[PDB]
């Protein structure tokens, strides 16, 4: 999944190409302090992407509850489709 | 009145009118891309030292 927004991080538009003199004068500064702030924006959002040494703390808490959901006094592998079928063959039959 | 011959605005407010923002610097991208892109490379590589390739596909030994 963080593939999947690297992807489209990669597809961000080179705000480099306009940092030079000529635009800085040219533009209203309203409009480069928020080019500039969506520069830094970028920043932020390509260092936390590549943060991958974050992915294992991050899968150990999805871990816990499921692990906990498989922790059934039924079964490990009940669900609600098998339970409902198990009850129609339990309802209908003769008692 | 010799000072309302002048003109009125100051040269500090020519100087914070005309240098507003602080400008980027161009080693700023290089900086902090590679910092990024060396996790980027630590993680992804296979011949990097911390790599993930055993931690996501673990082995068949």
């Known amino acids: 999944l963080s593939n999947e927004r690297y992807q489209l991080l990669s597809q961000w538009p080179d705000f480099t190409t306009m940092y030079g003199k000529d635009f800085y004068y040219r533009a209203h500064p309203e409009d480069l302090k928020k080019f500039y702030d969506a520069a830094d924006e970028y920043y932020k959002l390509y260092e936390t992407v590549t943060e991958f040494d974050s992915l294992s703390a991050l899968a150990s808490q999805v871990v816990p509850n499921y692990a906990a959901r498989r922790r059934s006094t039924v079964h490990p592998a009940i669900g609600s489709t098998v339970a409902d079928g198990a009850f129609t063959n339990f309802l209908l039959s003769k008692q | ?61």
């Open chain 2, 1 to 61: 009145d010799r000072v309302l011959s002048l003109p009125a605005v100051s040269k500090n407010q020519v100087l914070e009118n005309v240098f507003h923002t602080a400008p980027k610097a161009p080693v700023e991208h290089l900086e902090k891309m590679v910092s990024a892109n060396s996790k980027v490379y630590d993680a992804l590589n296979l011949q990097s030292k911390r790599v993930l390739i055993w931690q996501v596909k673990p082995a068949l030994f």
